Design a protein around this ligand. Structure first.
Ligand SMILES: [Cl-]
Ligand SMILES: [Cl-]
Ligand SMILES: [Cl-]
Ligand SMILES: [Cl-]
Ligand code: NI
Ligand code: NI
Ligand code: NI
Ligand code: NI
Ligand code: NI
Length: 398
């Protein structure tokens, strides 16, 4: 129903004009805390007035829409559109002292893009742009960049009583027929990602081993940084193209929760549920058909999510409850609440102003996968969160 932005203001969902106007008037929910108040804009020798207009827009909107004041945007020039030339300027900018880097790259070199993407992600918050593609575009890229800098554009308005529930988005994505990586991301009910971990790429044979370890790792991260946050209610949203190990995976996830209760990481009497979330085949109804929940069986539901970016086109999301420790009496109420929360989470996407209409707990892992899959395909540097608090706690994948 509404997004909360700055100064206690909220705006209706589903209206980007109102959201941008809201941000102009009130600011984002949380302006990032910067160290240098300096951003590098890195580009080539060409298109002077295009880049000047771009720089002017970035500067204007960072100030007026995002309420980040007194930012210096410094410029760095690369001389040829090749890895070595661009990275030198990237390195020089890092050495000057910058909070992040906005990098403009040529249209037609996809392996280069992913090589640099992996370099930057491992180094410093960054925003990539392409010469060939303005106010709409710049608007959207700033939502991502502000988030990467640690800002919170807007959050979902949820009940304060549920303020401390956590949702873990977890599962794996296959890179190919044999290799995959697992993920585990901790979210607040308001849709903010607190912590993210990814396993190394491993074979399918190792999936369950690394699934448990990745979940345990993200919860460790989160608990070490939030030691007085009691996890009394926990939901797992499992997704991804992953080894079809039904009972086995559910056994291991159930064990993972039980083990965390032992590391005293969640409360000894946590109420939890483990849900499988899957996009199913689209359909077209020839705002009734929307936050609509369809029960298929005691354990299986569909949410009729609207197709994003404008018959009503539905992109249904299947929701199956595979395990929970609720009482049979609690089950009706909990079901309704979990489905409602999933619906709300479908309105959270800091990729841009327009809702993705897929729950953030499923979508953000998909974004991670697109990057990892392409870095691996194009022979970029592995995304390596090891020793990077910035990576584990910021949405680098937007
Ligand atoms: Cl130079
Ligand atoms: Cl330089
Ligand atoms: Cl980007
Ligand atoms: Cl993007
Ligand atoms: Ni100003
Ligand atoms: Ni250096
Ligand atoms: Ni308790
Ligand atoms: Ni399933
Ligand atoms: Ni409801």
């Amino acid at each position: 129903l509404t997004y909360r932005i700055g100064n206690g203001a909220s705006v209706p969902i589903s209206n980007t004009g109102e959201l941008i106007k809201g941000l102009r008037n009130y600011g984002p929910y949380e302006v990032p805390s910067l160290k240098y108040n300096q951003i590098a804009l890195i580009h080539n020798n060409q298109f002077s007035s295009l880049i000047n207009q771009l720089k002017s827009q970035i500067s204007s909107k960072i100030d007026e829409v995002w309420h980040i004041h007194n930012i210096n945007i410094s410029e760095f020039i690369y001389d040829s559109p090749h890895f070595d030339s661009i990275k030198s300027q990237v390195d020089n900018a890092i050495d000057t002292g910058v909070d992040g880097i906005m990098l403009v790259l040529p249209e037609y070199n996809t392996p280069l893009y992913y090589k640099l993407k992996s370099y930057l992600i491992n180094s410093i918050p960054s925003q990539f742009m392409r010469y060939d593609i303005l106010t709409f575009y710049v608007d959207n890229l700033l939502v991502q960049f502000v988030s990467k800098l640690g800002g919170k554009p807007w959050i979902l308005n949820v009940d304060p009583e549920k303020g401390s529930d956590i949702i873990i988005g977890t599962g794996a994505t296959r890179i190919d027929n044999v290799n995959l990586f697992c993920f585990a991301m901790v979210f607040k009910k308001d849709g903010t990602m607190l912590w993210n971990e990814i396993s190394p790429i491993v074979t399918s044979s190792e999936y369950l081993t690394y699934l448990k370890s990745t979940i345990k790792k993200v919860v460790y991260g989160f608990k070490k940084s939030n030691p007085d946050w009691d996890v009394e209610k926990l939901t797992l949203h499992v997704s991804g193209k992953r080894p079809k190990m039904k009972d086995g995976e559910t056994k291991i996830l159930k064990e993972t929760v039980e083990e965390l209760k032992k590391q005293e990481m969640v409360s000894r009497d946590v109420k939890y549920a483990i849900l499988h979330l899957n996009e199913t085949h689209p359909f077209w109804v020839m705002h009734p058909y929307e936050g609509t929940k369809v029960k298929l069986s005691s354990k299986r539901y569909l949410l009729t999510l609207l197709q994003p970016y404008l018959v009503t086109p539905i992109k249904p999301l299947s929701v199956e409850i595979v395990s929970d420790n609720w009482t049979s009496e609690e089950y009706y109420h909990n079901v309704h609440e979990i489905l409602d929360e999933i619906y709300y989470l479908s309105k959270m996407n800091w990729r841009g102003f327009r809702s993705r209409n897929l729950p953030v707990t499923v979508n953000y892992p998909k974004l991670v996968a697109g990057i990892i899959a392409n870095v691996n395909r194009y022979g970029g540097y592995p995304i390596n969160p090891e020793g990077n608090r910035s990576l584990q706690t910021n949405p680098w994948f937007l």
